[PDB]
Amino acid sequence: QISVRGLAGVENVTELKKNFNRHLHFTLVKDRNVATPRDYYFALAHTVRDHLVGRWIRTQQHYYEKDPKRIYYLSLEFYMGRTLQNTMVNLALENACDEATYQLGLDMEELEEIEEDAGLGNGGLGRLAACFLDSMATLGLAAYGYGIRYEFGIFNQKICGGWQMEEADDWLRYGNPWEKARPEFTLPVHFYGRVEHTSQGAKWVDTQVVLAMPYDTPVPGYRNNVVNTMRLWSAKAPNDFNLGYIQAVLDRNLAENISRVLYPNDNFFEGKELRLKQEYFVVAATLQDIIRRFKSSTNFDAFPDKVAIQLNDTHPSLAIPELMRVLVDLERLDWDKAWEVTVKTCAYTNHTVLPEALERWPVHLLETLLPRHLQIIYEINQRFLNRVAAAFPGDVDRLRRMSLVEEGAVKRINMAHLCIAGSHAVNGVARIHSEILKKTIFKDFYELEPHKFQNKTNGITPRRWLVLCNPGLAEIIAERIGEEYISDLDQLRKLLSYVDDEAFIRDVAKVKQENKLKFAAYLEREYKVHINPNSLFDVQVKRIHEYKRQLLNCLHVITLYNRIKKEPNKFVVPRTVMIGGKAAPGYHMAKMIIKLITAIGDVVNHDPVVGDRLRVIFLENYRVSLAEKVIPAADLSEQISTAGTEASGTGNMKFMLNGALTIGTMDGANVEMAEEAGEENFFIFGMRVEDVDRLDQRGYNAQEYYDRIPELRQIIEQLSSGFFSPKQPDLFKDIVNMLMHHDRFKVFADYEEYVKCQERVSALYKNPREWTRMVIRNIATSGKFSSDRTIAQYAREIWGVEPSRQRLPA
Amino acid sequence: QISVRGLAGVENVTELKKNFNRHLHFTLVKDRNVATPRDYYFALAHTVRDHLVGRWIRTQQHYYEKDPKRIYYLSLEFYMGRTLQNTMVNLALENACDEATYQLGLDMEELEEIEEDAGLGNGGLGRLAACFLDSMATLGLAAYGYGIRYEFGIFNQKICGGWQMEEADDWLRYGNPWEKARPEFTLPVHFYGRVEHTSQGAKWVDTQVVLAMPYDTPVPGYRNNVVNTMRLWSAKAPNDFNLGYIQAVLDRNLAENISRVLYPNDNFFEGKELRLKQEYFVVAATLQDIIRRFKSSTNFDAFPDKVAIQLNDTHPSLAIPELMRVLVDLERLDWDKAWEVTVKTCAYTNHTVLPEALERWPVHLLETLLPRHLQIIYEINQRFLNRVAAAFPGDVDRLRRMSLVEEGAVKRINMAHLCIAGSHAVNGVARIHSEILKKTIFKDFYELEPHKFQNKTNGITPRRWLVLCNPGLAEIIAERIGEEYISDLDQLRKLLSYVDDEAFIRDVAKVKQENKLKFAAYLEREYKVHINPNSLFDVQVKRIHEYKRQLLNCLHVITLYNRIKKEPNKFVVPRTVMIGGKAAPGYHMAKMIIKLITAIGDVVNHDPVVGDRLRVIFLENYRVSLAEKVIPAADLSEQISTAGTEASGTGNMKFMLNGALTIGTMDGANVEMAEEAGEENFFIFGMRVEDVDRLDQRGYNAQEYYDRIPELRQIIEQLSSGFFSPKQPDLFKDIVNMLMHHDRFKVFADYEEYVKCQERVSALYKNPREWTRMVIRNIATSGKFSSDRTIAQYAREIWGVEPSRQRLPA
Ligand SMILES: COc1cc(Cl)c(O)c([C@@H]2O[C@H](CO)[C@@H](O)[C@H](O)[C@H]2O)c1
């Protein structure tokens, strides 16, 4: 049908059809008479998977023969979403499969909806790892993603009575056609035990052993015939485990629990033993695999020349003392040489400045679980602090501030400090964030080793986040400027010469309208909710968090409702306000915010006076596959975190690429987005980081705002009195109390500017031609935010490898 | 190479080779450079599996269109062993695959050894179910095996310091290429809860739900293109299960533990709740599946015409009250009609008379776990006892004897009584056993309903137990009488006309010698043990049990050793005494017997005076795949249970078919074996059932035998004094005490006759020509013991269906 989806040649379509029928028969053991849509999905998935394997085998053979420097991306999260369409896109198979399935009497889009998301992440950090894998393969890097194969990913969110309910994400129930179990490459991982000191060094003995079994998933590059590997470890008990008889077999579950479930916290540290085990499990198995592959090419001098390890936040920070452990205890290298190798090998990416999100592990936990690692950490600390003392003599407070060991009621290890000490590069994820790191939490470290600190602004892959989810837009762009932009997103700048092109303006607006119609139909079919497709689609989708200020959005929504009720017969630009995202199960305030949103909808959506001028919808079970649907349909992107709190954001970039305008604070990547597009083409409001600091020094008093803004007072009175909860008048008392007395994120402080900025949004939307021209100016300048750019910077500035756009032979 | 292994045509070999290479590439994602022997096994398994699927789909389509009466074989055990060679045999693919693999530069026998046993059984009962599935498919019956997919089958036995050690049988670690998961046919199973009585009947409410997920394994008939199904259920927690968050996900293990592990007890009842859950789980899921298939053909009058349910012992006895529950509570049939349907549908096979092996479930367990089933059982009992009272008025003791409810300190349900009451047929597994049932434990029931009681003598499949494991013998037989005997074993009678044929005599003896050489080489390669291949191979392989009297064998072994030590320079027929089998982990005496056997070997095998005239070897990890190796190599089969204790035995039949002579008591199927071959061609010794009864009435005094037999006294003194355990002189005190004071199985009573009979064995072995002629007379009369005969009898006399040897179109 459309150009960017590739060729549907007679030869290919015929071959795809027969292999589909072969898989249906031999693989699924079904015939067309008993086959269900799910069977048809799996037949297609297996058929598409077949096209990967040849390229997969020859890619890994190529790396063996050429022996390039290998990049190991260590992450506790890989938020992959669905794989079928992505594989078709990257292999140029989409139109051929569409044709083949059509001729078999099947609708491919219907089959695509059957695939479960691989929801092995919480939000931005997990999704970044996924975009990164895509970009590294597209840039021809010898890269491996290493993580955990969670049996249960991020929970499925149900909304019941307006409340979030969690259910297990049993994503493997029907099987995963993409993965290949590699039980032959199973590795032992050690826990507990004790340290013995011998004549010939330290020994870690009397340990409990858990097996790490790898599962490999192919990661195709965009039409370059490169297929890299994501290797995810699964925990297995050894066969002599606890070996009355029956209970001993049943107790195998204890060991295998390590890989059972993803901790469902976004940007929040939960110091539980099981989480620590997960973190060591991935690190220990990965490092053995790395060293094995390195030896199969004695001389560890060349280790950093052949290996780079990227730590996705501090979650895999134990890689540092584990590498030291292996090099010192097992390979018998002296400390100094081992340390040199470790530092040159490891690099660390920080994703947050929120105190509650930073990993600080109780010493007593590490003492029991990983006794040798604690000793190594202590030794690292001593030697590091000796360097600090030499550089800043007599500065005793600096010594306590920089220590990896934090003193107090419970002694803790600051994992970020460990990461900085043991890495040759430390980066933030957006320019403002990286600057904040150097000025605040890592200031001391920056002063000691300024060369270590870098910025690498985040990005998103234009394959998934444009071509896949928005083929209509990708096509109208390709009609003008060709297909090259898909792997060179900077080329979208060429679209600036079309900002006054009446044909292009109409087409851009047409694509949006179609996307909005498709999504409006999705909502009625799957959730029985009615929306006006001509309204402004005002969307905030992201994890529920106080810092992300879904509450500020709520206040605006209520303001709009109150203004309508005050002047019913006055014209207002119609809006559909969509808010979605999951709350961590233990995060009470976030769960309350979800209830507030649904409660507002319950009043707003049923008020006859409002009509269809205002609708408030909570988007249930927000996840990668839902993002791919809602983002192309959005007109307005809400990126309204308190300045200085959102390290980057990546959802913001997805909306920009897909033709939404952005209302946002100057926070994270928003700053660079506005810079690229021009501030005139962005809806910027609110305090800057400097203004937040000024308010903190003075003392934030929320009552002041309540006293001076009558519209804000009305809302708070409504919340308190039970306007949005008539049967439970005090339901939102916790929310009001927080807003009035202990709001860390200054919701009230940005309220006035937010509401005024929103008025300017509605004004522009009244002029469809000028709205669309601003949209074009956004899409045209979104190039910087391709993860291809991000990965190229990591490659050149951290990993010391050169990206390659060259095809491998097919 | 050999005729019975089928044709290796150019067309087939070429196609097999390319499909092997296809699977290696696409399925395993390997090339020849990195592939291991295990990879080669899986490529072959997948290639052979491909040949099943077409036949599998069309068989099940055939049953849908023809709608025959369906046979449901319910068992908690299916002791399947390896599947690859069996599939090749039944599909006539063996020579073709042998050729194809040879041309690829691979040895197929080497690849065959890589497959894990499906060890989902303990011994004879589990292996009978497996032989039965093979025969039902070969006889064209619409049969389904239903069981549990245990994650861990029978434990792997290691011998350490002469002691049995258990390790988990992680048979699914590398995957199972034979099974097809069918998550779409998942069914709910209910536990706990309570019974509510409404206006419209009883309701079982507030239950805990466990999901039953089926896995289907194909069961090919012998060259008839029939492929039946073994459906095994796996336990899955529902997604809202226990839905802090993390613990709730981790607690899913509780529900999934149902299908985790096989209870490793042979012929012994362990009344644990988890076992009861397993028994209900299989029954509940199976019955829903049965009824669903029956409806998809309202009128349950025709249910028994379209459905037969065979209960493999009392393990699935809950099928009876479960069927009643469904028919009465859910389908709203009146009691009497539902009962009529149930009785006509169900039939029960008993496999034991040992009191400790009979299932008697505490009422309090059933009360909590299955409250509605207990009520139904009580109602069944009341109505049954009313019939007894009417038939035998005033016989109050009969009423208490026949009750399904046993009174005492703990009230129990006698599951055998439940089975008899609710089945139209009750059978034992050998003529003597079935007679014992009518005369002893089920006497009262036989008097009330004589028509119910039948015999069905056990059998073994001649495919696995001759063609597969002994191709050399199958071939020399086929050379004389053709190939028809493989599915018509009675044809082996034709071999009686070859008993004086000098060529045949030489060939029979040659095949045995080759089998013995192959097994002697297996022992050195895998276990580093040295044996004399010219010695008499004296073997007892079966589960370790007091009733099977491995101890009597031990006494004979020590007798031989003592006699050699007394007269060293006297000639004795050299023997290799092989004993193997697993002890249930909680069975102390059985574990002690294993230690005794190894202890005897430790002395005997290292005494220079003995030389290679006597060797005692404990065969480690006895299992189906090992049986296939040792049985063809045996000269003498030890079948020496106390008369009246071994219901049938099936190992006995395997040895007979494979050219071993039998030393045995007149117990179980031994009686019919001796009857078929002629008592002159069997080594029968010891008490008959009647002699055991006489000794019981008089009182068994072991001291009497000790006092009157000096050779026996010497052995007991040796055991007591620490001759076989110098470092722990009192090690075998428990064994001696049992033998002397509380031996339920009268080991001493059969000692003299056993030793004398063994002398006659050695005498015959000295004359190789007459040994072999007796062997021929055994093989020639083994026809009755084909499971094809057994299944044909079940079909005609119980299930009311006619067997068919007709091919389905290929
Ligand atoms: C430990 O710090 C974390 C943890 C998690 Cl799970 C996470 O999603 C992020 C997010 O990581 C994303 C990727 O860098 C950023 O865009 C967001 O600003 C940031 O909040 C940061």
Ligand SMILES: COc1cc(Cl)c(O)c([C@@H]2O[C@H](CO)[C@@H](O)[C@H](O)[C@H]2O)c1
């Ligand atoms: C509950 O009674 C049982 C239980 C188990 Cl696990 C078993 O293997 C047997 C054996 O079942 C075999 C098959 O009928 C017979 O040949 C043997 O004589 C018998 O001991 C009987």
